[PDB]
Amino acid sequence: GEGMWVPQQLPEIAGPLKKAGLKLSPQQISDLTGDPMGAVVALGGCTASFVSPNGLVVTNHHCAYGAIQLNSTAENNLIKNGFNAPTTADEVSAGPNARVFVLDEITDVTKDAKAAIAAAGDDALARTKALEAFEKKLIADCEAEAGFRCRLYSFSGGNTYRLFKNLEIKDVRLAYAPPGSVGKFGGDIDNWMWPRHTGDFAFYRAYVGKDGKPAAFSKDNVPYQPKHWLKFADQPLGAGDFVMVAGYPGSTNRYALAAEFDNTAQWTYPTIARHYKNQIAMVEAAGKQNADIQVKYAATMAGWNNTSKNYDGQLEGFKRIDAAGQKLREEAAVLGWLKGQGAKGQPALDAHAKLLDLLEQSKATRDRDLTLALFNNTAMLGSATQLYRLSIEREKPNAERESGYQERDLPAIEGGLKQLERRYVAAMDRQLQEYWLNEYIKLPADQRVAAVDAWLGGNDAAAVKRALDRLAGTKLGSTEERLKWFAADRKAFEASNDPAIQYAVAVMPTLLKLEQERKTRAGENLAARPVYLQALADYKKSQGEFVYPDANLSLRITFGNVMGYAPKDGMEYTPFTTLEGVVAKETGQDPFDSPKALLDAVAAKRYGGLEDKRIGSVPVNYLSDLDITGGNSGSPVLDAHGKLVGLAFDGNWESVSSNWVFDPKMTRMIAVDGRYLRWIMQEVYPAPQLLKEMNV
Amino acid sequence: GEGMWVPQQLPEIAGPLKKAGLKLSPQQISDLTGDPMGAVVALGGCTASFVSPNGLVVTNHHCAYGAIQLNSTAENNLIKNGFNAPTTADEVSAGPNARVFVLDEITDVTKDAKAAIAAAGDDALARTKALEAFEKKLIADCEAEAGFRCRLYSFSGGNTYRLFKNLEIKDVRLAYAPPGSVGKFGGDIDNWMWPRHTGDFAFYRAYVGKDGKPAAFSKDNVPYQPKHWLKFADQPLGAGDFVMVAGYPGSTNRYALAAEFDNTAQWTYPTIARHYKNQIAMVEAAGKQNADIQVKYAATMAGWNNTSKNYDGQLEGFKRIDAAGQKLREEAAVLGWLKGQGAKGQPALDAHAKLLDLLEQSKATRDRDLTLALFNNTAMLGSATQLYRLSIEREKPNAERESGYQERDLPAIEGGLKQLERRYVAAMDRQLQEYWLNEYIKLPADQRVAAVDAWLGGNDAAAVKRALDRLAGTKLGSTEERLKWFAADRKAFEASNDPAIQYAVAVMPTLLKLEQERKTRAGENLAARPVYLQALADYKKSQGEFVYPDANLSLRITFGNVMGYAPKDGMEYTPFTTLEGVVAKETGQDPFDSPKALLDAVAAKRYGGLEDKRIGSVPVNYLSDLDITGGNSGSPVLDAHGKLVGLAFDGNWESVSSNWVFDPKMTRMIAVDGRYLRWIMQEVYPAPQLLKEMNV
């Protein structure tokens, strides 16, 4: 059922967990560095878990997709073929930016954070800068112990702040990936859908120095020896059985003004979906002629497809549940209830008014803001602007450098510059530049940016072509040139005749002004947000509803049971899919082109010792009433005894609007069964070394 | 489960019946004029049943649709509005061809029929004429008692013959029909589909003379008083409950040569559907501008839509189960089996080669044969050929007149000419004549018909124009001219300058010779069919498989349980639909435009004492594993104690290929719950008088 519960809420879910079927004590779950919770790790936007004492990590194929793609070429395409390392020496690097974060400690810092903020006084921009400096100091102190990365989280609109400290493993290697047609069976057609038949798993191994301490990739590194790791279930998972997930959901918007919802549904989602579909269509068309573009843009294209389809689904779910109407009546109720409370309610009512105004302020420039951000997110302009900004930040003392441009960020920035080699083709990027220039030109006069208008020097197809022709002379196309500029100083950027550098120099003052504006709004939000969201929480509690913070990339627990759902009268979706349903979807063409060893093994009914009698087959995926979102991909699903029975990977079509308005009847997790991981690794793309190492 | 069982097979199915849940004794089901089987009646291509001691008969809406359509105009549309007669004096005639047949006696006459067949040559034609003669004399003797009609039936390819004797009620009146948006909710979109939400019901009353003998419509007639009628269940029907149907399935082809299947799959079904779709497109156009053409062509349209969709379904179901493969493979295996026992398996093997040749013979002219038959089925040419042929037969002694043209056929002949008034518009028929001439002209030259070539004046657009212009001259467009010719002698037809009559007089010698060719082809069939079919049966028995005769318009029993089915892995269709499901499909446009009163009753949860707790609503339609086919519409569904729980009306989409190859996993009846009939009559389109009459 509902709720992305923080660990600190365990006392409150202890009873519900037992009722649902958990056989572990709640204290055993409350030990976040113990067994089994200490086996759960963060990857930075996906979750994973250890599954051997020698550092083996399991997650979704779509989480490892970036790493598989970085190790792929047109001629040797691991996305297509899978990957398998017979020995740990055969493992390939997942890329310099790949990470496994192992939870060490969580600290409440709410009192100190709120004091740092209060000490700024009336000024919105100061209040932002106070919170920044507080965070920077806190994180510098916490990261004084080498090998650790820390993160500060704000919960419930700034009513609670906690600090997380994590061991930061920085040498992550790819150990195994099934073929693409298993890992992404059904592709974008089955994305966000049930029935689902997708073997969405992959394995990493985590490495540290011979001295035990995190290091970047080196052949002298050796496997990390985790304190705790998961075991595979020895009891067959069935319909109605208890399941629980712990992971790192990224963002929800369940506490939101009706106006924030209205702008999202009416403008944000449709606009983004359209832009992403336009880019898909260009890249798709060009990748058909050019297998180098197809392999280099594949991870980008996966993200665009997934987000744009998610947004289409949210819009449809909003209509199905009348989310607009719900948000309007709920807000009417909360404001009523507040007015109800005399003077005691006034601070929340005023905070509501301030939040509404700040939404209006961001709305006035939304087209400009989005269009400029995505234009500058093309590969050369993004490299130019990032690196120019770094050169500026490098002239301030580290403590005053903008988050993302501090010494602690330099490894990521450098890694990003190298990884781009596997993700960029000039003739492809050119067409994306051109799309965004043509979108820019459609902006009305008050959403335009002088610096870009002057650089374009024209408002028509010829000016667009001249600009593209100019940018095409950049040298930032090569990794070596990007790294040169990574180390160069500000005056060197300002002297350059590289046309992408020249663009970054021309626009940077405007970028910095826009950033100050966003910080100013954020500072006003810091004043109003906690007070209104505390009112929302108090109101929900007075109605007997579940109260838990919106997702914010920190560790949450959700629990419930294996069950289907009923999309329309006269039909039900069953909790499981089976091997035969995979074969039934076979067409021999992408995305429905399973490995021939799969087709043969199912035809021959080789169930590998993994058959569940109750469904007559090996299970493939299943549905459950857990409450997950983006960031939970790769989260282990645990049974009543804390054993691994699957990995979370998706939500069904109707679930996705639950980001804004939770619907219990149609909100389900889609998970890949542990038995299907094992079956694939037995019968289809064998990895007998890994099954051995997992004691199966 | 599988089986359209003859009542004589009751001993075989007694134990199966008990195991499935029948609580009546098998010998009570055996009493075909007892309780409840004696309440089941035949309408002629639909079933129905008695539901009060005053002659009330319930059947489907689409079985009553002819009658409703006959009593409808543009300016009073009963199809749209429904019909309710508050007293029996208000009931309108169903039309002169409408019948209720009440079963009186079955007789085996197999020995006699086979002797009479044998007694003929060894000439094929004489064999047909000898069976014809034998049937005619049986029927003449059986019909000698005023008020009865009799039928001879051949079962299992001519291994058994039984004679049925029926009371023939000839005055049938409409008592109630719900509005078309209930009776045909979902129209042709939901036709042949589940989930289904269609209230497919209507009521007649049966009338006899004041002496209690059958008579044609008159205001002196009085309600028939049936010896047995059905009672509504008092136990709620739920999932897994026992159900059974008795009724009159028309045709199955489950005993068939593989090439029979192939020709049907590859030629017959595709061709007929194509033709039917083309006529639909034409009539649909002309009726959207023309309310009179729309109403008058409504029943014809419904028929074309329904068969063409059925055939589209049968083709898809063939591909889904590889019907062609399964047929080929089964035929191999029974050919195998037969040579198999050499000496004694020799008559059967011979038979197969005959049947196969006969089929190649049909095949030679099949395009000619279809095109000619359908061309002559247009309204004016059909009337003129039928009427001229009647003039020719009337010159022979009645015992030698062709079946369909004897004294006993005159009522239905005369009736059809009158009913044609409600189904004919000259502008529309012209377009249909055009359509079929166009199709005739493109016959390949060896499949032309000499007389029609001549009648036409060679074959191009010009001749077609002239054809049509000429036939427009007919006076057969009026009921009265048609009846004038119903009485006229043969030389009066040959004298006529009516252009439609002149077509018939021109073409008849050909039609008679073609008929002779068919009777000859059939006679040869009469030899080989019973022997080869009896071997198909013998082989099924030896494989433990179920053995029952293909359907033949005679009374059959099917039994099983209420259950869903699973079209694809990860989903199931539930056994019931509910009121809420009807409202979810609402669009306010045809065909999803329920009565305001239904929409309001469902919004209000006014379930009228009819809610079934297990599904949380009033049931609408339900699925079960009974084995029904065309002719079974209107058949009453009975529960374990012989109470009415439903009417059969359709099959799910994947069921329909079971006409050729029975698939138990996807073959379900779709029925309308007796609770929904009651609910509609309480809350939506009320008929308190009929509810009181049925003791509910």
Ligand SMILES: [Zn+2]
């Ligand atoms: Zn452990």
Ligand SMILES: [Zn+2]
């Ligand atoms: Zn470096």
Ligand SMILES: [Zn+2]
């Ligand atoms: Zn088994």
Ligand SMILES: [Zn+2]
């Ligand atoms: Zn008459």
Ligand SMILES: [Zn+2]
């Ligand atoms: Zn109730």
